[PDB]
Design a protein around this nucleic acid. Structure first.
Lengths: 394, 394, 48
RNA sequence: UUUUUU
RNA sequence: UUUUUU
RNA sequence: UUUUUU
RNA sequence: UUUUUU
């Protein structure tokens, strides 16, 4: 028998199971007021711990589907969240004024309703819900890194989007305690992330300012924790008209097993379809078989070759056991790409004067690229020094 | 007659027998409160010695099957546990408030009910049961090694999972007396281990934080006490397009009998199907015929060749009678793989300048690998020195 | 024998294994209430 | 993010 | 576990 | 008996 | 009579 099929058992599910998750959709007549009080209860730091998915789904249905609930129920968002296990029950209250009136009579909701009794809500318009969802979308690139990287990329996008002047956020939203709260809100809730990823891909026509902000930040979330996929598919597995060809640094007999297992675990990622870019942010299925520790030499060689082409990839951190092979593959790819561009300049130049012009241009191009790579490595070194200074501050 | 069939008698069962094990499934209306008091009685150190399988199965049915017991009864978990001998009887109590009311009237349950009279339970939510099962899943890689290795890998995974911020465990769960208790709970109970292995393989869609933690730790449990299977199938029995070919260190006439008996006892392991990775952790059938002492030279040569490819396998311990042949096979495979990569570099390089680039790269690659192998050997030497210091401390 | 794809035999395999588990749990239910009916008739015969 | 001129 | 840039 | 790493 | 190891 084929004894090498033992290594592939226990991988792929043979009888797939989902767990039911009951999520409460609120339906009043004063729906914009209920959604603005859910926004104010989230901004106040009040932990609404079981009604979080229900409050965020009330906000998202009221923004994108106009709180209709039959347009929402037949949408592909609701088909996806039904297949992922969620069950929507719509509780109704025809004369409900405040969010305090709408909470059920379970006894663990008592600290929530005594917190919501003393909470002051400001009267606000229809355009606060799209402002809140656009602010929650800014944390989606570098969500899977951590809280510091998300807050830094979020404040950089606040300055970019206010430099266009199209939005303004209030100044207590940009305090880092409040941004820490909104990071934990987006990290702990699956359906807000999926609704923002879906409506960033698919709501494309007739744009508001808020919907263009959400689509811009969702377009930067693509392969957010899947750098090894972009580096291997762009540089190792080379695409040409003959087919797929390996790199010369990976054609020996000790890394070809790792590229075979990477091809297999890669083709199980495209089973997710159009959310396969968004696989680590949504925590999908096959992302445990795309870790760096499963493929140490392939990740280090691929990051070295990708650093040798794009100069801004020298600021990624990596583990200590991968840095030195990464630097060796970087130096080998700089010499190999220099030999290739010299031979192509000899191919395409039709006279020696043109050949001298092209050789001076491509020499100056590589010197510019090398100076940019040293500048971004020094930026990484004082960035880690400022981080360790903040470590020894506390 | 074939007299060499005498060596294969008494191996495989000819009339297979199972023993009935009666396990008590509790069914109240206040099921989350009963399961949280079972969690609090496990955390307190109270030995609930006959109701352990019943309490853990009550927790697992209430988490994964929503305490439905007709969804559970027709699941493949219950078919597997019926074929493995367990019999479920569901006792019912429609108005049962505490776990004290639900214990039967056997006289050996008297120290349990006097311990449960004075036990204080804290009111807690639905999300404590998944937290407890996710904490019990962290001990599953390196379960079959021992208690120190399980607690060390568990605390490393606590720091990894809290560095993502997705969970927090209370600080008295991370005391090593409490982790020693939870190790003995998971080690002494078959059905908690199997339910976590099944739901780590098969619950894959629409993930919670807890279910992704359980699937991550079950994906590291694959071949947990079956290192000889991974080393022999990856390096000795070489897979290529022509077929299976032996390694040059094992093609003589004294190790070929051991690889024939390893092929036979290996093909009886894949009779277990999709739990054949999980064979030592679940204590399945053919794992006594995969011991290192049955195949001393094949295990030492396979571990040497696997150390010569992957540099982190120099930190495995082995017995004293296998270390020296392992070091000889390691040195022979370093020289053999160096000769092969030199011949393949001569094959794939199209010019001598490219050949000099590739020879400098692959030389630097082997020097990096050799320095990492000496670093992990020195890590093993002060790890065993710290262990013997703890031996002479007591 | 009766499927056409691997997806079709995966759906039919999941159906017939759930159907066999349904009839086995029903058979055990009938056996337990048969045992309790015989025990109650013997308790009435001992009472009478 | 965009960046000139008419 | 993840790590850049836009 | 098992022994690494992720 | 049997004699190791796992």
């Amino acid at each position: 028998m084929d004894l090498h099929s033992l290594l592939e058992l226990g991988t792929k599910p043979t009888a797939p199971h989902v767990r039911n998750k009951k999520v409460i959709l609120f339906d009043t007549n004063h729906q914009v007021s209920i959604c603005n009080q859910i926004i104010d209860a989230i901004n106040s730091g009040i932990d609404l711990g079981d009604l979080l998915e229900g409050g965020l789904l009330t906000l998202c249905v009221e923004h994108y589907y106009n709180s209709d609930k039959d347009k929402f129920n037949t949408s592909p968002i609701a088909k996806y969240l039904r297949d992922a296990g969620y069950e929507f029950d719509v509780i109704k209250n025809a004369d409900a004024t405040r969010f305090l009136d709408v909470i059920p009579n379970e006894p663990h909701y008592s600290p929530l309703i005594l917190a919501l009794k003393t909470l002051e809500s400001t009267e606000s318009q229809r355009g606060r819900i799209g402002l809140f969802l656009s602010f929650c979308s800014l944390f989606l690139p570098k969500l899977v890194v951590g809280d510091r990287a998300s807050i830094e990329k979020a404040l950089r996008q606040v300055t970019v989007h206010q430099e266009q002047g199209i939005v303004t956020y209030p100044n207590h939203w940009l305090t880092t305690g409040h941004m820490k709260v909104i990071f934990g809100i987006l990290r702990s809730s699956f359906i807000l992330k999926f609704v923002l990823i879906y409506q960033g891909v698919n709501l494309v026509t007739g744009h508001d300012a808020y919907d263009s902000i959400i689509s811009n930040s969702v377009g930067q979330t693509r392969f957010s924790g899947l750098l090894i996929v972009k580096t291997v598919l762009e540089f190792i597995l080379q695409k040409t008209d003959s087919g797929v060809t390996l790199h010369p640094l990976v054609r020996t007999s000790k890394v070809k097993n790792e590229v075979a297992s990477f091809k297999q675990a890669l083709s199980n990622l495209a089973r997710h379809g159009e959310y396969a870019p968004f696989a680590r942010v949504l925590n999908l299925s096959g992302i445990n078989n795309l870790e760096h520790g499963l493929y140490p030499q392939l990740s280090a060689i691929a990051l070295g070759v990708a650093t040798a082409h794009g100069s801004t990839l020298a600021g990624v951190n990596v583990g200590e056991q991968y840095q030195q092979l990464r630097e060796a593959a970087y130096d080998a790819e700089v010499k190999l790409q220099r030999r290739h561009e010299h031979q192509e300049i000899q191919a395409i130049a039709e006279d020696d004067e043109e050949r001298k012009i092209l050789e001076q241009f491509h020499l100056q191009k590589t010197e510019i690229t090398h100076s940019q790579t040293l500048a971004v490595l020094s930026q990484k070194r004082e960035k880690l020094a400022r981080l360790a200074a903040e470590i020894e501050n506390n």
